[PDB]
Amino acid sequence: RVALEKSVSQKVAAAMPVRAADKLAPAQYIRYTPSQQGVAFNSGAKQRVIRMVEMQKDPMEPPRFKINKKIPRGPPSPPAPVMHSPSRKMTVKEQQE
Amino acid sequence: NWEDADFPILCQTCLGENPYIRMTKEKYGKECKICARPFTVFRWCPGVRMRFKKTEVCQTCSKLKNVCQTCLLDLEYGLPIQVRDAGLSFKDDMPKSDVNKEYYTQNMEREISNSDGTRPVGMLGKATSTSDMLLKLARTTPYYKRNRPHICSFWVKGECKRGEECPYRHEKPTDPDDPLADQNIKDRYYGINDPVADKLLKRASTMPRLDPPEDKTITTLYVGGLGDTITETDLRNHFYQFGEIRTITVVQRQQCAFIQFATRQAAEVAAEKSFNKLIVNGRRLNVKWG
Amino acid sequence: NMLNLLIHRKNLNYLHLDYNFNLKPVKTLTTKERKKSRFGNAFHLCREVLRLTKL
Amino acid sequence: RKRKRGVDYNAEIPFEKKPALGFYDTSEENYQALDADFRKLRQQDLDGEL
Amino acid sequence: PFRTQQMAAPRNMLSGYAEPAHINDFMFEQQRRTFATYGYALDPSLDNHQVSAKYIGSVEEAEKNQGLTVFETGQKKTEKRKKFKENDASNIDGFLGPWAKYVDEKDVAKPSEEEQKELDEITAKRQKKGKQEEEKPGEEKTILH
Amino acid sequence: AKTVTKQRVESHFDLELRAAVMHDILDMMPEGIKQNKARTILQHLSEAWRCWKAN
Amino acid sequence: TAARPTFEPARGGRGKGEGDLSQLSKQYSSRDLPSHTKIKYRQTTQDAPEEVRNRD
RNA sequence: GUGCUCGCUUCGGCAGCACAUAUACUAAAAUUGGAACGAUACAGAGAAGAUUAGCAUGGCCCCUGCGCAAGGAUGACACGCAAAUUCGUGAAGCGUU
RNA sequence: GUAAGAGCCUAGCAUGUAGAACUGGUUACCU
Ligand SMILES: [Mg+2]
Ligand SMILES: [Mg+2]
Ligand SMILES: [Mg+2]
Ligand SMILES: [Zn+2]
Ligand SMILES: [Zn+2]
Ligand SMILES: [Zn+2]
């Protein structure tokens, strides 16, 4: 139920897109290890800390990109083995009837 | 589908020379320069006199081809994709025509989002077998001339009214009568007719390399720069890898060691492994034919 | 400005919104141009509300 | 040429599925292409007799 | 031996390991402006050798200026640039309070005497590719067969 | 997903009846029958309804 | 020809709520407005599941 | 920059301290490609004779509409040598074992 | 006898991109 309600909220957010229009400043930190070490890269360091602020959205701005573009259905997931029985033998008489 | 993944996939010559970065995250900011689907654009400034670089391609289009999202160079080596596929195979064959491209992108996006989220989904097994010529021209230290503000086009008309305050460079642009000037995004990304990669391959082809055994069945190796500080007991300990080793003549006066193997295939394999690579006891051992 | 940026984004250069929010065709339209340039109650409600406020 | 699709047919393989691979090495072998013979060949000759 | 530098590193998504930190804002931006102003800062890596405290940058200027930050009173104080001043706001078309340009450096920067001609040449090189002018070739061509 | 309002009612009934008959003949045939012949049985259903209306 | 039956229906999963909510469209109908935003539950006299559990 | 400095100490300069602490999709651009439903020529409404109401079906076709209404020629497209696994009888003539 | 293919013709709406890879070489024995 906790997993479902989140997806519900993300769907329902379209139904009222702008009622008390949104707020965004949880500016957060992330520690990152370049996996490139051999140092001439940070300056001599092994990690780097990055402060992420989310870009502030314009209230008065329409959707940006074309979404109506339409493409055919991709391949389905790999076929399952069919697991039937040996198969009943069929007669000429019943095949004709 | 949208892309929407946190914290981009970046190299170290674009992420900056400062270990303290402030970047902004825009949720569906631009469209991808390849995929043409919208993705999460991250904008940071590397250093002080830099350009505010941003990611150009999707997380997905970098997971396909193991590249950085803004320089479009290999995360491990720092080279164009045509050079790395030259030093590998080319079995991806990403479509370039329209409907095929969006169809392939949809299916590979389902493939990646039906997996872990850590490996270069097709490039992994071929990325095991590496260390071709690309390692001998891999860039050692970052080229921070990439992160650099463009030529002031008002200064080209001699009319830059900002003068000393303009954050764009007042220096010469490159002569357009140059192969190293055209450089489309998709040409750099698919590995097709990239002139930077052409010049890197022309340099790596004229890199010094093995010669064949000119006369038949001769396995004789002519070792110059042998050195008088090393021992022949370590030579066999390095050399029993290849096969049935025959006699090893040693001349420590000209610093030349003569080597014979069973088959000429083993001598060619030793030529492959040894030439211009092998440094034992911290001292370069040169091997030649004749 | 909003209403005729909506007009000019739809490439309807043969319509003209005057300064009192009257929408008139500049020329005599074909059937295809007339079907392309039919607006709905949203556009005309906003246009007539703006007519009342400009009065 | 002004159309969205359509040039995708000769340029590459249209909605290409690679054959699923396994248990037998299928990388060395390859097929020999068609002899052109562009001095006898007819549109009727490729499609065959209806 | 069947893994590379990227494949042997403890990575989380294709280029390394990324984990949420909780550094204090002031100290973070302090070391950030310390590197952006002078060229050195303390190391935010959490092990790297597990001994005391190393500086990561242009470490030669770090000991020269004692390892100071931007929030602290500096050692050097010399060679100030000279600017105009008219803080009165009483003379019209003479006031420039904080909009005071320096006395030495000035506005529009033409490149040079030769650089302009070279840029004219490079625009002319661009012009020959656009191409649009084509005279009707009346050049005569004859001889005696 | 267009709604079945008033002008789609009879067409949708005939669209769904035909699908029900498709399912029933796929399940009614025994194990080794050639799995063609759906179209012919649907033609017979159309004919039986026209003979029903024709008495 | 033009007049023809179906013999295959349309498959769901490729539009407006199907995979990424049509990549998060800002289009919504009047019928998609907030309405009946509170589930009623069965009370003690109605047929609450505690009342229905002990019963023979 | 301002102020306090029982700072040198004049009303000039300097010293210390306090407060104040990191804008910018960085352009007045250079470029770079794609579109319109208008003319201009050819062209002319689906249902086995003709004249025709329509309602659907399917998706790498969309348009007007706020529309899960409704229209767009029933909006258009759909017209196909429509061949998918898998064979056998009987008699006669000729050559062969 | 239509305002649509087709099909031509001329058109103009979006971008402010990513990128520039450039250096090394010796010779010698017995019949
Ligand atoms: Mg209709
Ligand atoms: Mg009709
Ligand atoms: Mg229809
Ligand atoms: Zn992409
Ligand atoms: Zn990069
Ligand atoms: Zn400038």
Curated annotation (Swiss-Prot), chain C:
Protein location: Nucleus; Nucleus speckle
Superkingdom in the source lineage: Eukaryota
Tissue expression remark: Widely expressed.
Disease: Retinitis pigmentosa 13: A retinal dystrophy belonging to the group of pigmentary retinopathies. Retinitis pigmentosa is characterized by retinal pigment deposits visible on fundus examination and primary loss of rod photoreceptor cells followed by secondary loss of cone photoreceptors. Patients typically have night vision blindness and loss of midperipheral visual field. As their condition progresses, they lose their far peripheral visual field and eventually central vision as well.
Quaternary structure note: Part of the U5 snRNP complex. Component of the U4/U6-U5 tri-snRNP complex composed of the U4, U6 and U5 snRNAs and at least PRPF3, PRPF4, PRPF6, PRPF8, PRPF31, SNRNP200, TXNL4A, SNRNP40, DDX23, CD2BP2, PPIH, SNU13, EFTUD2, SART1 and USP39. Component of the U5.U4atac/U6atac snRNP complexes in U12-dependent spliceosomes. Within the minor spliceosome, which acts on U12-type introns, interacts with PPIL2 and RBM48. Core component of U2-type precatalytic, catalytic and postcatalytic spliceosomal complexes. Found in a mRNA splicing-dependent exon junction complex (EJC) with SRRM1.
Name of the molecule in the record: Pre-mRNA-processing-splicing factor 8
Residues of the full protein shown: 502 to 556 of 2335
Curated annotation (Swiss-Prot), chain D:
Record text on subunit structure and interactions: Homodimer. Interacts with DAPK3. Component of the precatalytic, catalytic and postcatalytic spliceosome complexes. Part of a spliceosomal 'core' complex consisting of CDC5L, PLRG1, SPF27, CCAP1, CCAP3 and CCAP6. Interacts with PLRG1, Lodestar/TTF2, and NIPP1/PPP1R8. Component of the minor spliceosome, which splices U12-type introns. Within this complex, interacts with SCNM1. Component of the PRP19-CDC5L splicing complex composed of a core complex comprising a homotetramer of PRPF19, CDC5L, PLRG1 and BCAS2, and at least three less stably associated proteins CTNNBL1, CWC15 and HSPA8.
Associated clinical condition: A chromosomal aberration involving CDC5L is found in multicystic renal dysplasia. Translocation t(6;19)(p21;q13.1) with USF2.
Its biological purpose: DNA-binding protein involved in cell cycle control. May act as a transcription activator. Plays a role in pre-mRNA splicing as core component of precatalytic, catalytic and postcatalytic spliceosomal complexes. Component of the PRP19-CDC5L complex that forms an integral part of the spliceosome and is required for activating pre-mRNA splicing. The PRP19-CDC5L complex may also play a role in the response to DNA damage (DDR). As a component of the minor spliceosome, involved in the splicing of U12-type introns in pre-mRNAs.
Modified residues (Phosphothreonine): T26
Annotated spans, Required for interaction with CTNNBL1: 1-5
Cross-link Glycyl lysine isopeptide (Lys-Gly) (interchain with G-Cter in SUMO2), sequence positions: K18
Curated annotation (Swiss-Prot), chain E:
This protein's GO CC annotations: catalytic step 2 spliceosome; nuclear speck; nucleoplasm; U2-type catalytic step 2 spliceosome
Keyword Nucleus: yes
Naturally occurring in which organism (per UniProt): Homo sapiens (Human)
Disease: Pontocerebellar hypoplasia 15: A form of pontocerebellar hypoplasia, a disorder characterized by structural defects of the pons and cerebellum, evident upon brain imaging. PCH15 is a severe autosomal recessive form characterized by progressive microcephaly, and poor or absent psychomotor development with severely impaired intellectual development apparent from birth. Other features may include spastic quadriplegia, early-onset seizures, and chronic anemia and thrombocytopenia.
GO biological process, one term: embryonic brain development
Localization per Swiss-Prot or TrEMBL: Nucleus; Nucleus speckle
Keyword annotations of the record: Disease variant, Intellectual disability, mRNA processing, mRNA splicing, Nucleus, Phosphoprotein, Repeat, Spliceosome, WD repeat
Predominant cellular place of this UniProt entry's protein: nucleus
Range of the intact protein held here: 98 to 242 of 579
Entry function: Required for pre-mRNA splicing as component of the activated spliceosome. Plays an important role in embryonic brain development; this function does not require proline isomerization.
GO molecular function: mRNA binding; RNA binding
Descriptive protein name: Pre-mRNA-processing factor 17
Swiss-Prot record, chain G:
Modification sites for Phosphothreonine: T45
Family the entry assigns: Belongs to the CWC15 family.
Superkingdom, taxonomy of origin: Eukaryota
Annotated function: Involved in pre-mRNA splicing as component of the spliceosome. Component of the PRP19-CDC5L complex that forms an integral part of the spliceosome and is required for activating pre-mRNA splicing. As a component of the minor spliceosome, involved in the splicing of U12-type introns in pre-mRNAs.
Compartment annotation: Nucleus
Polar residues compositional bias, start-end: 22-32
Subunit relationships: Identified in the spliceosome C complex. Component of the PRP19-CDC5L splicing complex composed of a core complex comprising a homotetramer of PRPF19, CDC5L, PLRG1 and BCAS2, and at least three less stably associated proteins CTNNBL1, CWC15 and HSPA8. Interacts directly with CTNNBL1 in the complex. Component of the minor spliceosome, which splices U12-type introns.
Residues with the N6-acetyllysine modification: K16
Record's protein name: Spliceosome-associated protein CWC15 homolog
